[PDB]
Homo-oligomer: A and B are copies of this chain.
Amino acid sequence: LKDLDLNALFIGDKAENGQLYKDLLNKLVDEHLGWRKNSDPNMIGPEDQNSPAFKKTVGHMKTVLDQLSERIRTESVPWHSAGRYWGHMNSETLMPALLAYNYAMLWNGNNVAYESSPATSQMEEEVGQEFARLMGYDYGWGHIVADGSLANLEGLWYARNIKSLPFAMKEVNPELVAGKSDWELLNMPTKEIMDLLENAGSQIDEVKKRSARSGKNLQRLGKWLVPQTKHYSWMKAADIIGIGLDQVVPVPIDSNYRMDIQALESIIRKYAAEKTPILGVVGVAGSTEEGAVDGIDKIVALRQKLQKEGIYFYLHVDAAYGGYARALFLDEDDQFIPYKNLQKVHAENHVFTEDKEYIKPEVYAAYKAFDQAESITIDPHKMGYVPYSAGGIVIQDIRMRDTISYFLLGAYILEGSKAGATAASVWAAHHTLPLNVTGYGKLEGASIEGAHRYYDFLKNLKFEVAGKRISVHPLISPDFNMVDYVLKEDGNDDLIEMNRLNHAFYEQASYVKGSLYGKEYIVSHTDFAIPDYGDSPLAFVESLGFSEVEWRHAGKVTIIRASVMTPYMNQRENFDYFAPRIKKAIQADLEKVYA
């Protein structure tokens, strides 16, 4: 697939490939309709179709769809326009994923029961194998979940039930764990748990009855450690799963907005000295507001270190946003690419348009260590470009599914009924674009390169407006494809005024419901506030000349946010066209803020 052309796989910002989409859709719908036809005799005949009541019912249906159409066309946000839109959301999806959904949903199969939908059931089995291969799990498994928040919950459900198994085994058959103290039982590695459970053989059902599934001993299972900026799905997941919000422990992040691994170790050692177990740790690959990648490799090394002293924790990687990026690192046979060969393999497969370093070494090392996590959340509906709703969960060892199972897919998942059409959509996206450099690598690469062009363009911007001098100050070089920055009046050390400036700028560079005048530059915004960030933004705000005192008084810094998900800005010629226009739009927006 060396010459795979991404331009052919999307409808396009201006529906440039609309006719292709229509042609393929009509062909697939014809195939379904032919299939229903190809017996007797017609429940609905030409006598029915011609009646006055039938035609009036058709008219009624058409009126409701016209009302639907009106609302969606006039209340939706203007469609994203590459080169102008530098905000946090993307709605564009892979055309083969849209088509496959459109076709499959005509069968209306339900993937909880193989019977109702054998082909999409098999497609979900294949997608789960494809996730496991992406993450480097030789004996793993995965499935499609309604969304990544529920995948996170499923992750905690595994961790919770797994932690509780050693004691459950002791209750059912003390010889399975003979000689182990309670602190050893609370610090058994997950592989050793699954090997014991396998040895328990026929007693697995009784063992499961005495596990956390029984509701007993939940608080004993210990602390769930997350970065302080965790997505709120994690707080909900601890609430829902019964360990509770009291057991969630925030771990400080560093100046790169990554979980501070020295602080992680200090927290873990302090709980372990009290004999409080660590239920698990969440590492994030692709944070929600900075696209930061945590040092998953540093967490795995820390765990190996602590295992020597009798301490173990479950590791879950929340890669809801960053999951598909592991495709950058896998060759056409799905093998992990050595770091020194990376630029060469990328150049050969046209992942990046220029041959330079694009991936930070510590980002590479973090992604390399995924295969050591017990479980991973990944969302086709984010950076997989599959339409909502489609989340995903990957587990390291397929035997883990027996810890949550009920008495095939339906027996092994948190949720109930699910659309076979969803599996068709994800399956079609994966087979059009393999999960390595030949497929998704190119798509994730185009996004990263457009984020780098944008980042490079923003670091040298100054504006003269209403007698004042304003500079752009990028937050950090992006780990992935999110780029953040602040505007600031030169020499002005009032953080509250800087906050007000970025907020007002955002209001000038954003649409409102009903907007029809196109804007040349659209951004997003968010606040980094002390309650979720602590002092992680302090070095940045001090670098700008604000004092620590000023930080505590304002209590937050307002940040202009961009998640670069369009593939079109990777090309120098495309980006260069918009760069001078963006600069003119920022200048006019500042004129309006100060007027």
Nearest Cβ on chain B to A210's Cβ, whole angstroms: 9
Q: Is the CB of B213 within 8 A of A242?
A: no
> Is A552 interfacial (CB-CB < 8 Å)?
no
> Is A306 interfacial (CB-CB < 8 Å)?
no
Partner of A79, one of B17, B35, B49: B35
Nearest CB in chain B to that of A117: its residue? B76
- Please indicate the chain B residues that have their CB under 8 angstroms from the CB of A42 in the complex: 12, 14, 16
Q: Which of A96, A381, A388 has the most CB of B within 10 A?
A: A388
Q: Is the CB of A33 within 8 A of B18?
A: yes
Q: Is the CB of A122 within 8 A of B75?
A: yes
> Is A51 interfacial (CB-CB < 8 Å)?
yes
- Please indicate the chain B residues that have their CB under 8 angstroms from the CB of A4 in the complex: 53, 57, 60
Query: Among residues 1 to 50 in chain A, which have CB atoms less than 8 Å away from a CB atom of chain B?
Result: 1, 3-9, 11-18, 20-22, 24-26, 28-37, 39, 42-45, 48-49
Nearest Cβ on chain B to A39's Cβ, whole angstroms: 5
> Is A417 interfacial (CB-CB < 8 Å)?
yes
Q: Complex Cα distance A6/B48, Å?
A: 10
Nearest CB in chain B to that of A115: its residue? B77
Interface 9-residue window, one of A145-153, A252-260, A297-305, A358-366: A145-153
Q: Which of A7, A123, A411 has the most CB of B within 10 A?
A: A7
Number of copies: 2
Interface 9-residue window, one of A215-223, A337-345, A474-482, A496-504: A215-223
Q: Is the CB of B1 within 8 A of A417?
A: no
Q: Is the CB of A146 within 8 A of B215?
A: no
> Is A543 interfacial (CB-CB < 8 Å)?
no
Q: Is the CB of B235 within 8 A of A216?
A: no
Main SS class of interface, A: helix
Q: Complex Cα distance A3/B424, Å?
A: 38
Q: Is the CB of A24 within 8 A of B214?
A: no
Query: Among residues 417 to 431 in chain A, which have CB atoms less than 8 Å away from a CB atom of chain B?
Result: 417-422, 424, 427-428, 431
Q: Is the CB of B12 within 8 A of A43?
A: yes
Q: Complex Cα distance A110/B418, Å?
A: 18
Q: Is the CB of B107 within 8 A of A91?
A: yes
> Is A554 interfacial (CB-CB < 8 Å)?
no
> Is A119 interfacial (CB-CB < 8 Å)?
yes
> Is A106 interfacial (CB-CB < 8 Å)?
yes
A-B contact list, 28 entries, CB within 8 Å: A4-B57, A5-B57, A9-B61, A21-B29, A21-B33, A24-B62, A31-B73, A32-B73, A68-B427, A69-B103, A75-B122, A76-B118, A76-B119, A77-B115, A93-B108, A98-B105, A102-B105, A108-B387, A149-B410, A215-B242, A215-B245, A216-B246, A218-B242, A232-B406, A235-B406, A240-B242, A240-B414, A242-B242
* Sample of 5 further A-B pairs with CB below 8 A, known A26-B26, A39-B81: A98-B105, A110-B389, A149-B415, A233-B416, A388-B420
Q: When A and B form their complex, which 9 residue pairs have the shortest distance between CB atoms, in order from nearest? A: A242-B242, A215-B244, A149-B416, A75-B119, A146-B146, A16-B44, A8-B57, A18-B33, A3-B53
